[PDB]
Amino acid sequence: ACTKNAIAQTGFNKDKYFNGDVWYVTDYLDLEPDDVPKRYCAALAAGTASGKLKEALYHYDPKTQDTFYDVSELQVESLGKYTANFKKVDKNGNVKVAVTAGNYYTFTVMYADDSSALIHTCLHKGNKDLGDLYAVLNRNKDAAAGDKVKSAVSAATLEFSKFISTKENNCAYDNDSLKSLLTK
Ligand code: HEM
């Protein structure tokens, strides 16, 4: 279960974050791991599409090859804090699993600038017991975490040394499908 009320970034710039571009997860911290995808690739696009606030998600497990995309319309709770009901889609946006109540994630932007970000998410998916997940994002899939975002990890009272890197998984992403999915 989740246990954190993540604090959104003071003066969070929503139009800059939600500009329709892609963010890559470079490092993550799951507060309830198992034994676990210690190996994992993830990326998202975030933008406004025809006046609606949207995110498109991509997950890939580089060992099992388990692959899935999601699209969500985000609802605002407060600045930098959202509730997202998701639908699993193929890369082209055709629905595989429809939106349903009980399938949602919260999303908090704790820190962001033009190249990097720190987010918290709490996933809810039917029957599952899932925990808090923090992710360090960058606009460049290969970028080592900078002092700006590492300071934010500290300020959130976390230790960046506990985060797991995704960079040794040689992830490759379809940026084009992530951007396109924002409209779907
Ligand atoms: C690198 C970090 C990531 C890891 C390692 C990870 C891992 C996973 C795994 C293992 C599941 C499958 C859960 C279940 O079915 O048992 C999953 C699903 C999901 N994750 Fe992540 N995730 C990460 C990042 C993200 C981010 C950044 C978000 C939100 C922005 C997110 C949103 C979701 C959603 C919505 C699902 C359910 C999708 C569906 O069933 O259609 N994940 N994640």
| 3-class DSSP state of 151 | helix
Tokens of 159: 């230790």
Instruction: Scan for tokens 């995309």, then name that residue.
Output: 69
Atom number in ligand 1 closest to CA 137:
27
The pairing of strands 67-78 and 19-30 is: unpaired
Tokens of 81: 């804090």
CA–CA dist 170, 168 (Å, integer): 6
Q: Residue ranges per domain, the chain? A: 1-184
Atom number in ligand 1 closest to CA 97:
41
State in Å: Cα 84 to ligand 1 middle: 13
Ligand 1 pocket, residue 162 CB under 6 Å: no
State in Å: Cα 154 to ligand 1 middle: 24
Ligand 1 pocket, residue 173 CB under 6 Å: no
Q: How was this structure determined?
A: X-ray
Q: Is 120 annotated as a binding residue?
A: no
Ligand 1 pocket, residue 47 CB under 6 Å: no
Q: Could you tell me the fold of the domain covering 1-184?
A: Lipocalin (2.40.128)
Number of other CB atoms surrounding residue 153 within 10 Å: 22
CA–CA dist 82, 92 (Å, integer): 24
State in Å: Cα 148 to ligand 1 middle: 25
What Å distances lie between residue 146 and 11, 21, 111, CA to CA? Answer: 20, 20, 12
State in Å: Cα 34 to ligand 1 middle: 14
**Resolution of this PDB entry, in A?**
1.4
Ligand 1 pocket, residue 125 CB under 6 Å: yes
CA–CA dist 28, 111 (Å, integer): 14
> What is the number of helices (H) and of strands (E) in the chain?
3, 10
Burial (Cβ within 10 Å: 0-12, 13-18, ≥19) of residue 96: exposed
